[PDB]
């Protein structure tokens, strides 16, 4: 369960 790993 990861955090917001979407690219910046």
């Amino acid at each position, epitope marked *: 369960s990861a955090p*917001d790993t979407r*690219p910046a």
Partner: single-chain antibody
Amino acid sequence: QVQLQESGGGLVQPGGSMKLSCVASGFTFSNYWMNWVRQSPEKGLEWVAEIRLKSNNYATHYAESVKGRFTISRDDSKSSVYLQMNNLRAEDTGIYYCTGVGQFAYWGQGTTVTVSDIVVTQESALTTSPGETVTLTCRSSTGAVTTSNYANWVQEKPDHLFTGLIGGTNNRAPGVPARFSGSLIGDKAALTITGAQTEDEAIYFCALWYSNHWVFGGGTKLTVLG
């Protein structure tokens, strides 16, 4: 120049309520999770709540210090996030920031609210000089830091001006100067400034992720002398 602008704070009585707002521009707001984080002199920087995407049915998580009392919401059509704060207590006093993106690149200017168990450890202070290489570290009380903690590093400059430097252990946030890098070293997260500049004198905080919440470290005061 992405912008997050908070509003709503003030001077409030214990037992009361208020709602903070935050309006975003410059990035696709609706693709990112958003967070509220607060700063007080005592208790330092403290993650409060997060809200995820429409595709996650806007799922939320809260710090245990505010669960039952606070509600985070977003309005993607107005690119806004909100924090409804009920049953306020003295300990809720602080500066409140909306922040997000990979994972804490963008911070609002903050709104002041005056009301009247993992420890993450950082060096209290380090001193360096222009042109030197300095490394700050971030230890977890649970054991080793791994990439599963998605270590973030954030810089605080005067006056309570926060900017994210590093997310996901070693990903530099957009527009962050190349002298900053993230690593894992000796089972700690670390931030390195390779060639410190006078303007890097600042307070640096790390954040580590544990499954569904962030714990901030207490911050490191970096002095750049000479």
